[PDB]
């Protein structure tokens, strides 16, 4: 339903699209292009005004019945091919396909992670992209940096303290295991920003997913109360394009659909200037329900104890 | 997850709940209660302190580990008795319960009545409430009007006219069909109000709800288009309390987790001052998915030739 016109009006995230592909005609002209998770189409539109011989698009939504008709009414019923299906249950790509030059695909979930199709981009790859096939997008980058929310964390967690009298610190826990969806602003940053994951579609394998471990690493700018961490991803088209084409998901430019997700600590940092915060972060499927996505941190400020804690994506 | 957090901080029906219950500890003082949907057992925390001698809650969560642990914290195990389960698969109440004195629920959803367990307390009702018993609330009734939403209407619905350059006119039939929740202001508001349905817990019947058929009819008091229909409903604890209890999810107060729905119209309609706006409003759950919500609407302006508009809740 309305899930199409949130990433439609996405400005950051479809222009990003639109300028990758219709910018490098060169690149599309006469190619065999598949689309993955094509919903309403515009990408596959995108890629049929920029020269392709074929466009494939799959998505298993009933959504593509209306998408054809999009198709049709802007005059490329004969260059795009819509398939109402998982990728996982394609036999053969229609017209005789069983290559493809170019994958275009929206993979990105909440977090990068959280509910991704990225596995079902790596199939398709693995399946029909050809030798130097290019993938829009292909990289994507995780940031992380801690951040001053004292009026956030009181309303979202102390909240449970006293609830009309009531004690329900029992849900405490379990409102701090929540990462948080939501906008930040800027000015509540107050560490440097740590790179802390880098997913390159051209090579990454499916069995490197089970389980990423990775670092990260920042330093604290003020004298300051850290409450959360921040964490937001860029996306670039790198292989393929022209120039690269890149977007982000962070606080310092327009927003998007996917916001930026916020981390509550159980314990408030007192930051001091050029105080340095380093650690791991561990991000896997969750054993009991596989759509969730458990994140583990273990962090120290300055060399301190080890400070950990847990959170569940659900 | 952060479901029962949006009820709880709905302060507009929680202290309508609170209110209705701890004014009333003459009326709850030693009798049994049952709350249908407990969740983090806040009304049951509610009916305990009222004096109740046994609160029995039901939910199918498992919230109810949780919960538990809240009524131990608060000191109400000995009173509070927790169930993990659909009603309608619960064999006996505990403690040899056979009737109850007062049914706790909140039920209403969407428009009332999408993805509402009305008919879950209706059951509960019939095999447990014993004669004269109490439910709170009891009573909710739906209201409609018309109103200008110029601004909303073309950023929602003639959006699909032209998306970067493509016509995707397609999609409009279904973009209207769809109502939306969202808040109003009352400034949008140009005619008098209609309340259209009234819902009676003490008398309905579960075949009464397989198809609703009701009338409307409001009045323009301006010179003006009207771009949608807007609705919203009261509800009322009416019998039981001393004296009645009631919160509203309209546009002319505080706003509550349910905003309230709008009905985009396919046609604007030229209102003068005085033209009479009446029809039919039907609702039935939906043939082919049964989550879903059927809203059919055929009225007149002025006597004039029939309007009709579908919606389906989904
Ligand atoms: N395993 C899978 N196989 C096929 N389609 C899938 C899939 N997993 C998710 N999808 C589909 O992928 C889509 C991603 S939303 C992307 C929408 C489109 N690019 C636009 O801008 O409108 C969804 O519509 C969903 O139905
Ligand atoms: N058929 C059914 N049987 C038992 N519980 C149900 C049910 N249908 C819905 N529910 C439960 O009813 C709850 C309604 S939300 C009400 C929450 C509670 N009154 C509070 O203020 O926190 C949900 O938690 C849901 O799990």
């Given at each position: 339903?309305?899930?199409?016109?949130?990433?439609?009006?996405?400005?950051?995230?479809?222009?990003?699209?639109?300028?990758?592909?219709?910018?490098?005609?060169?690149?599309?002209?006469?190619?065999?292009?598949?689309?993955?998770?094509?919903?309403?189409?515009?990408?596959?539109?995108?890629?049929?005004?920029?020269?392709?011989?074929?466009?494939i698009?799959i998505?298993?939504?009933?959504?593509?019945?209306?998408?054809?008709?999009?198709?049709?009414?802007?005059?490329?019923?004969?260059?795009?091919?819509?398939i109402?299906g998982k990728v996982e249950d394609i036999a053969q790509l229609?017209?005789?396909?069983?290559?493809?030059?170019?994958?275009?695909?929206?993979?990105?979930?909440?977090?990068?992670?959280?509910?991704?199709?990225?596995?079902?981009?790596?199939?398709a790859?693995?399946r029909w992209?050809?030798?130097?096939?290019?993938?829009?997008?292909?990289?994507?980058?995780?940031?992380?940096?801690?951040?001053?929310?004292?009026?956030?964390?009181?309303?979202?967690?102390?909240?449970?303290?006293?609830?009309?009298?009531?004690?329900?610190?029992?849900?405490?826990?379990?409102?701090?295991?929540?990462?948080?969806?939501?906008?930040?602003?800027?000015?509540?940053?107050?560490?440097?920003?740590?790179?802390?994951?880098?997913?390159?579609?051209?090579?990454?394998?499916?069995?490197?997913?089970?389980?990423?471990?990775?670092?990260?690493?920042?330093?604290?700018?003020?004298?300051?109360?850290?409450?959360?961490?921040?964490?937001?991803?860029?996306?670039?088209?790198?292989?393929?394009?022209?120039?690269?084409?890149?977007?982000?998901?962070?606080?310092?430019?327009?927003?998007?659909?996917?916001?930026?997700?916020?981390?509550?600590?159980?314990?408030?940092?007192?930051?001091?200037?050029?105080?340095?915060?380093?650690?791991?972060?561990?991000?896997?499927?969750?054993?009991?329900?596989?759509?969730?996505?458990?994140?583990?941190?273990?962090?120290?400020?300055?060399?301190?104890?080890?400070?950990?804690?847990?959170?569940?994506?659900?």
């Amino acid at each position: 339903f309305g899930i199409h016109e949130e990433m439609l009006k996405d400005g950051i995230r479809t222009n990003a699209y639109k300028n990758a592909i219709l910018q490098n005609k060169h690149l599309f002209k006469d190619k065999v292009v598949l689309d993955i998770g094509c919903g309403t189409g515009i990408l596959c539109l995108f890629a049929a005004k920029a020269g392709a011989k074929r466009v494939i698009g799959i998505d298993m939504s009933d959504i593509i019945d209306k998408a054809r008709q999009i198709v049709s009414d802007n005059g490329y019923s004969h260059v795009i091919e819509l398939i109402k299906g998982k990728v996982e249950d394609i036999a053969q790509l229609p017209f005789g396909i069983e290559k493809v030059d170019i994958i275009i695909s929206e993979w990105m979930g909440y977090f990068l992670l959280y509910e991704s199709m990225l596995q079902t981009v790596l199939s398709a790859r693995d399946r029909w992209l050809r030798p130097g096939g290019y993938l829009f997008p292909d990289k994507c980058t995780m940031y992380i940096c801690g951040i001053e929310d004292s009026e956030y964390k009181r309303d979202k967690i102390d909240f449970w303290d006293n609830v009309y009298g009531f004690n329900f610190s029992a849900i405490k826990a379990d409102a701090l295991r929540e990462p948080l969806v939501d906008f930040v602003e800027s000015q509540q940053i107050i560490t440097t920003q740590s790179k802390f994951l880098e997913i390159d579609l051209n090579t990454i394998q499916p069995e490197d997913l089970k389980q990423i471990t990775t670092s990260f690493e920042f330093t604290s700018q003020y004298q300051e109360y850290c409450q959360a961490f921040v964490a937001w991803f860029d996306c670039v088209f790198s292989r393929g394009p022209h120039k690269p084409v890149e977007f982000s998901t962070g606080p310092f430019t327009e927003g998007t659909h996917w916001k930026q997700t916020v981390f509550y600590l159980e314990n408030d940092l007192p930051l001091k200037p050029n105080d340095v915060i380093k650690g791991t972060i561990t991000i896997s499927q969750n054993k009991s329900n596989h759509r969730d996505l458990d994140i583990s941190m273990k962090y120290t400020v300055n060399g301190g104890a080890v400070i950990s804690q847990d959170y569940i994506m659900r």
